[PDB]
Structure formats: structure tokens, C-alpha cells
Amino acid sequence: HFLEIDKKNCCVFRDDFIVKVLPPVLGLEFIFGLLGNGLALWIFCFHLKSWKSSRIFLFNLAVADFLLIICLPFLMDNYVRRWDWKFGDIPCRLMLFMLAMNRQGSIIFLTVVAVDRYFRVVHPHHALNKISNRTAAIISCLLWGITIGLTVHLLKKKMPIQNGGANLCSSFSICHTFQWHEAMFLLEFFLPLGIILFCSARIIWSLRQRQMDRHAKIKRAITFIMVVAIVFVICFLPSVVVRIRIFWLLHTSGTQNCEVYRSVDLAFFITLSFTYMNSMLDPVVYYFSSP
Ligand SMILES: O=C(O)c1cccnc1
């Protein structure tokens, strides 16, 4: 029906067919992501005898994805029990913060490795290519500071919203208002998408015009740059387009009738799982590749 949130008249339902498809999806995600991220972190922690900036950034990406998919199982249980998150108040804040901060970190580090590749390919002699490991550590800590600085507001709020008989633990909710959460999601998709697309296009154009693509290994690198672009789009475009659609019908129509939302809600959360695929799809493209 129509619920109520302070200063925000919201309406989010508990429709079925969300506990039969989403829990198995999240189970597969957690299994594969935990396995891949553990087998990736094993090399970095123990049997990697070198480092440098690019491996620093890949290690940070793996750390972010690892924390994300260890955060997954509680969210999986929350989906299983049909929005009945019966853990408390601190667990809600922690899980929402973990999910959002780790997604921001994954996206920011994807963008930064794309920019690193763009500098390494189009401007090989730029001073940013020759960057010290301490400088890389400072830059990565600064990036983590930027990531956290936009997300601590999920710790101040009372996340476990009690309504009717249920305890909602969802940061993504639809309300007749604009908050920094939705806007941050919008830029989270758009601006890194623009940077990644520009970097990939410039890399491809410079490599092809240099006519060095004839090498049997450059072709694999090009196809994996393309692959990383397409997987980024595949995991991030659906949820964002559903958010744009719900913004459109919220602006045009409003919240007078709450029954024009059901569909645009349900698939939304399903699309919301697509980005978690990135966590379980990053190891195959980023680390396990490039022999
Ligand atoms: O941040 C997320 O991905 C999220 C937020 C609320 C509910 N489910 C997932």
C-alpha cells in the first residue's frame, strides 16, 4: 500500500517472486565471488614478488569486491525472508554502508585503472606512468577517503525502518523527494561511464592507428578492454535506466496512486543484483587474464 517516511511520502512493497529468483542469484554470486576473490588475494598476499601502481590498484579493487561479497550473504537472507531483516540497527547501518562504499570503490577503481591504461597507452611518456609505490598508496588512500566521504551519511540514519510488521534494510527506496543517494547513484553511473568510454575509445583508436595491433597478444588486450567496457555497461545500465524511468513517472505523475510502481520496483532490485555480477566477473577479466 502507501507507507510513510518522515518528510518523504514513500511507497515500497513486498511483492512475491522476489524470494525465488533473487536468493539463488545472490547465492551463486556469493559462491563465485568469494572463491575468485580468495584465489586472487592469495597471490597478492603470498606469491606475488612484485607490485607497482597497477597491481596496487588491482589489489584495492579485489579488496573492495571481497568485502562486498562477504557482505552479500546477510543481504541474501534479508531477501529470503521477504524484507524481514531481523538483526538490529547497527547491522543495517553496517550492511548498507558496506554495500554502497564497496560499490563506489569498485566503480572508482575501475575508472582509475581505465585512466591508468589510457595514460599507459595514449601517453606512454607521461610522468604519471612512472609513479612511485608510496605515491600510489597515498593516491589509493585518498580515493578510499573520497569513497567513504560520500557514504558515511548511511551510518547516521536509522536504517532499520519498522513498518507494519517488517523491518526494511534497503538504502534504495522510492520517495517523492530528491536525496544525495539517488543523485550519487546517477553520477556513479554516468561520470565513470563517460570516463571509461572515453578512455577505452582513445586506447583503441591510438592502438589501431599505430598499426601495432597485428601482434597476437595486443588483440587479446584489445578484446579484454572491450569486454570490460561491455560488462561495466551490462551490470550498471539496467538499474540506472529503471531509476531514470521511475524518476520520469514520479515527476510526470507523482505518488497520488502507488499501484503504478509494482513492476518498476520489482525488476529494479533484480537489476540491482547485476552490479554484484561485476564483483564475481572482475577476477576473470582483470587478474586471471593478461598472461
Ligand atoms: O546498495 C545496494 O546495492 C542495496 C541497497 C538496498 C537494498 N539492496 C541493495
Numbering used by the authors: 9 to 299
Text of the article:
HCAR2 responds to niacin (nicotinic acid, also known as vitamin B3) as well as other ketone body-containing metabolites such as beta-hydroxybutyrate (BHB). W91ECL1 presses against the ligands, helping to hold them in a stable pose. In the NanoBiT assay, the N862.63Y, Y872.64A, W91ECL1S, L1073.32F, N1103.35A, S17845.51A, F2777.36A and Y2847.43A mutants showed marked decreases in Gi activity and β-arrestin1 recruitment; R1113.36A and F180ECL2A lost Gi activity and β-arrestin1 recruitment completely. The side-chain of N862.63 lies about 5 Å from bound niacin, and makes a hydrogen bond with the carbonyl of C177ECL2. The niacin complex gives Root Mean Square Deviation (RMSD) values of only 0.59 Å or 0.79 Å for all 291 Cα atoms with the acipimox and GSK256073 complexes respectively. The presence of P168ECL2 and a beta hairpin loop further reduce the flexibility of ECL2. For structural studies, we used an N-terminally BRIL-fused HCAR2 construct.
Hydroxycarboxylic acid receptors (HCAR1, HCAR2, and HCAR3) transduce Gi/o signaling upon biding to molecules such as lactic acid, butyric acid and 3-hydroxyoctanoic acid, which are associated with lipolytic and atherogenic activity, and neuroinflammation. The ligand binding pocket lies deeply buried within the HCAR2 structure, surrounded by TM2, TM3 and TM7, with ECL2 acting as a lid for the orthosteric binding site. A distinct hairpin loop at the HCAR2 N-terminus and extra-cellular loop 2 (ECL2) completely enclose the ligand.
